[PDB]
A = this chain, B = another copy of it.
Amino acid sequence: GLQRTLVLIKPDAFERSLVAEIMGRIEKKNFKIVSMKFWSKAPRNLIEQHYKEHSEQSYFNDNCDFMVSGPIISIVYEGTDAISKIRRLQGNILTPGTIRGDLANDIRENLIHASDSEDSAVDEISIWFPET
């Protein structure tokens, strides 16, 4: 059951030099890069589209400002059950063994985004890779 899912490497990973570390954890779990873009600075409307379901929250504006404060990488990964597996790999800051659990300690600056559903996956892929 192959799926594809959208990942973003966030500006705190560039600042802290953790880009290969995060990418390597997904690589070691046998997921493949199908497409990839580097953005020295992502255009703000792409970020706002990406986070559109969050538009009414108190943190919305501040988080977009963080996301435009440095480089980001967008990646489409392919593999069995990709969506849910990469989501678990991302985890959270309370859970040792995961990316966030081992390397992050903040509510905003948490290194990585992964799609959490099939629909969000489909939509997020179309935002960052509209040539399809």
Q: A102 contacts B23, CB within 8 Å?
A: no
Tally A residues with Cβ within 8 Å of B: 43
The answer to the question of A105 belonging to the interface, with a C-beta cut-off of 8 Å to chain B, is yes
Q: Does A33 contact B (CB under 8 A)?
A: yes
Report the minimum CB–CB distance from A77 to chain B (whole Å). Answer: 11
Contacts of A19 in B (CB 8 A): 23-24, 27, 33
Contacts of A106 in B (CB 8 A): 80
Take A80-B106, A101-B97, A105-B85 as given contacts and tell me if A20 and B29 are in contact as well, using a CB distance cutoff of 8 Å. Answer: no
Q: Could you say which of A35, A73, A97 has the most chain B C-beta atoms within 10 Å of its C-beta?
A: A97
- Chain B, residue nearest A93 (CB): B85
